[PDB]
Amino acid sequence: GPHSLSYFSTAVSRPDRGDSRFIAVGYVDDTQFVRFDSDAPNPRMEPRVPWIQQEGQEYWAEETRKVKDNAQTYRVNLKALRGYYNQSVAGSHTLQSMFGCYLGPDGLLLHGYRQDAYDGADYIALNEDLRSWTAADMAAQITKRKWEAADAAEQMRSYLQGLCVESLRKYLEMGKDTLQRAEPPKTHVTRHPSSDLGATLRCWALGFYPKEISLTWQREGQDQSQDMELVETRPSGDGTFQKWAALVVPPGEEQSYTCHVQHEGLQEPLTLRWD
Amino acid sequence: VARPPKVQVYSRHPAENGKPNYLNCYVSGFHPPQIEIDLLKNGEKMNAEQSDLSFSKDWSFYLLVHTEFTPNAVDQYSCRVKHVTLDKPKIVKWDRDH
Amino acid sequence: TMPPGFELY
């Protein structure tokens, strides 16, 4: 692999509405499979892909129970943090939490993690030994101290080692026909005339999965990265991804340039030129 | 650490006039999470869905605003983004090339 | 599956 299961949660205080909003999303590798929005009518954990829908009612009831508990708890944390820092009562603040597990070679936990941020800044994070915390400032040390006496790390560690990996193995099976097959990119090289000394070639990679991909340009075998424009990998909207890399080639030199595409869905690296 | 949103407006499939497609506006790398993202058709807001709020490993939020659409020779499409970091709305127009 | 409980700051 390594495959992964991860959750991303965002809690935002709304003093002008008397409460806060909590949003959580779950991923298996690059595929979001669940979501929770505390603003939604009847807030519950909802499926986001077909394969997770085969989970029974107790799954959804339990995930909803837990995520609502997470929401209420982080609403309180926001209130605490405002005091801890002595911030305004009218200001809206943001609490982000991220955590997940990777699947090791022998089916055991690989690099579990847990990290929280307040207003974009590091707050507290679980260390690599899964038994200690790094606190980023004065306020975070107060929290860190509580969590040490209460051995909060053991809860997190046992989750990452047990339930998290176990669920990951279970999810990978449920969505095997989708999560375990790499979908290779559809590739294209397009051309777009600019000015006298301006003629742009663009190499496209479309509809691929997983997200990881490598697009590069060569000139007779010479990397042109320093010259090319590479956009951020972007979602296609159907669970796949897109990306492109473009550069300006001299008038008449199209055929000296080649785009190279590398992705796990591909048997071998693809060499593309302006056909 | 407030930071500006990046914006990409693009279609799911290579666009051809008169053929049903999907218009995407991918907005990422921003903080704080409060943001306004509108897909515009000839300068007018369209009905469009917005993904659930999420973020990448550097804490930067990202959102996808998407709707079905059938591009043609006349209609102009763009995406308008409002963020506390931006003195005025950021507008990126769509084209089949980029 | 989400964890069982979530800690106060």
Author numbering:
A (entry chain A): 1 to 275
B (entry chain B): 1 to 98
C (entry chain C): 1 to 9
Paper text:
Swine MHC class I has been referred to as swine lymphocyte antigen (SLA-I). SLA-I molecules can present viral peptide epitopes to swine CD8+ T cells and induce the CTL response to kill the infected cells. Similar to human MHC (also known as human leukocyte antigen, HLA), SLA-I molecules are a highly polymorphic gene superfamily whose peptide-binding specificities are significantly influenced by highly variable sites. In an attempt to identify anti-PRRSV CTL epitopes in this study, first, predicted peptide epitopes derived from PRRSV were synthesized, and a trimolecular complex, the structure of the epitope from PRRSV-NSP9 (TMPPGFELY, termed NSP9-TMP9)-bound SLA-1*1502 (pSLA-1*1502), was solved.
SLA-1*1502 in complex with NSP9-TMP9 was crystallized in the P212121 space group with a high resolution of 2.20 Å. The pSLA-1*1502 complex displays a canonical p/MHC I structure, including the α1, α2, and α3 domains of the HC and the light chain sβ2m. NSP9-TMP9 is located in the peptide-binding groove (PBG) formed by the α1 and α2 domains. The NSP9-TMP9 peptide is fixed by 15 hydrogen bonds with residues in the N- and C-termini of the PBG, and no hydrogen bonds were observed in the middle portion (P3–P7). Based on the surface model, the P4 and P8 residues are located outside the PBG, and their side chains are solvent accessible, especially the P8 residue, which is at the top position of the NSP9-TMP9 peptide conformation. The A pocket of pSLA-1*1502, composed of Leu5, Tyr7, Phe33, Tyr59, Glu63, Tyr159, Leu163, Ser167, and Tyr171, fixes P1-Thr via hydrogen bonds and strong van der Waals forces (VDWs). Due to the small Ser167 residue, the N-terminus of the PBG of SLA I molecules appears to be more open than in other MHC I molecules. The non-polar Met156 causes the D pocket of SLA-1*1502 to be hydrophobic, in contrast to the charged D pocket of SLA-1*0401 or SLA-3*hs0202. The F pocket of pSLA-1*1502 consists of Asn77, Ala80, Leu81, Tyr84, Leu95, Asp116, Tyr123, Ile124 Thr143, and Lys146 and shows numerous interactions with P9-Tyr, reflecting a key anchoring site. According to these results, the P2, P3, and P9 residues are the primary anchor residues of the epitope peptides presented by SLA-1*1502.
